Specification:
Blueprint (H helix, E strand, L loop, with lengths): L2 H14 L5 H15 L3 H10 L7 H17 L4 H12 L4 H24 L5 H19 L6 H17 L31 H20 L5 H17 L4 H13 L10 H16 L8 H10 L4 H7 L11
Length: 320
């Protein structure tokens, strides 16, 4: 039999399976149509995406994973799949929403790169970009979700948006796995459709929302630690924001969330110290030495540990 005949038979078998193990069969189809004969991907998209209607949380999560892989194989498929992802981002179940956020964190930067590479933007591509951008705005809003886990996942998406929409500098410290991700400095200033200036303002607004979040009296301990992490990442990857990050740490420490300001205070302090020290280690911190040092002493950081993490001015040669 042929590959497409086997795909049909597998899909027909998946239809009879009454539990989450149908995902085994759907993964076999995914392998056949994404990896073994990629020309089939187009022809069987509707059949996999039909499972977004499955009552199983795990099967809907699988469909989100499939959309991510399909779009990483062929970014043009986002034209057909962004609506399906938008529906899953709005799923009734918080775990499906979380996975949809994780996938948006991978796909936003890829769709943006595709837009930037395109000099003529079709009607379909425009509507796709409109939806990607709306969904990004929607995830920013999820910083205010009633669900603790959704808030935590939204933080990471927002971190990624801020970094994506700001420029790399000579002393940006970029994780190797992210080396090839688009950043604002790679967006031509005269692209006729993607406007550099507008993206810059969006990235600054995203950071503004994250700084406000960090400092809010109702966030949870896991939200707090995740946001501290995200802001340290931003300070190191995008040192033009280091001032704003240090100030947010300052404001947090002066105004601890009342629910964490007694038994939990040692843990909050430790975590703030560890994150602040990771910022100090970066050579752009030397411009804010007095501020950082003061805050570290205030957190009870021993002088020796401050000294040990202090960069040498020699480390500032890349952008003094």
């Amino acid at each position: 039999m042929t590959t497409s005949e086997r795909v049909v038979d597998l899909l027909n078998q998946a239809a009879l399976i009454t539990n989450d193990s149908k995902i085994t069969v759907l993964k076999q189809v995914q392998e056949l149509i994404i990896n073994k004969d990629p020309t089939l991907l187009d022809n069987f998209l509707d059949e996999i995406i039909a499972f977004q209607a499955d009552k199983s949380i795990e099967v809907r999560k699988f469909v989100i994973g499939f959309i991510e892989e399909a779009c990483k194989r062929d970014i043009e498929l986002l034209l057909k799949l962004i609506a399906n992802l938008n529906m899953l981002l709005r799923d009734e179940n918080v775990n499906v929403v979380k996975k949809a956020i994780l996938t948006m964190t991978q796909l936003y930067k890829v769709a943006l790169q595709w837009m930037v590479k395109s000099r003529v933007i079709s009607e379909l591509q425009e509507a796709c970009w409109d939806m990607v951008s709306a969904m990004a705005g929607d995830i920013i809003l999820l910083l205010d979700s009633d669900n603790d886990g959704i808030r935590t996942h939204a933080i990471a998406f927002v971190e990624g948006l801020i970094v994506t929409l700001s420029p790399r500098m000579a002393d940006s410290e970029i994780p190797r796995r992210q080396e090839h991700d688009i950043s604002l400095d790679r967006i031509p200033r005269d692209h006729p459709y993607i406007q550099y200036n507008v993206l810059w303002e969006e990235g600054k607004a995203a950071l503004e929302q994250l700084l406000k979040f960090m400092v809010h009296p109702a966030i949870s301990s896991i939200n707090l630690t995740t946001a501290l992490g995200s802001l340290a990442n931003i300070a190191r990857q995008r040192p033009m924001f280091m001032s704003e990050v240090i100030q947010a740490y300052e404001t947090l420490h002066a105004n601890l969330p009342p629910t964490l300001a007694k038994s939990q205070v040692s843990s909050v302090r430790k975590n703030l110290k560890l994150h602040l020290l990771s910022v100090l280690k970066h050579p752009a911190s030397l411009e804010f030495q007095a501020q950082i040092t003061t805050l570290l002493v205030d957190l009870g950081t021993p002088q020796a540990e401050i000294a040990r993490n202090m960069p040498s001015s020699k480390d500032t040669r890349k952008r003094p």
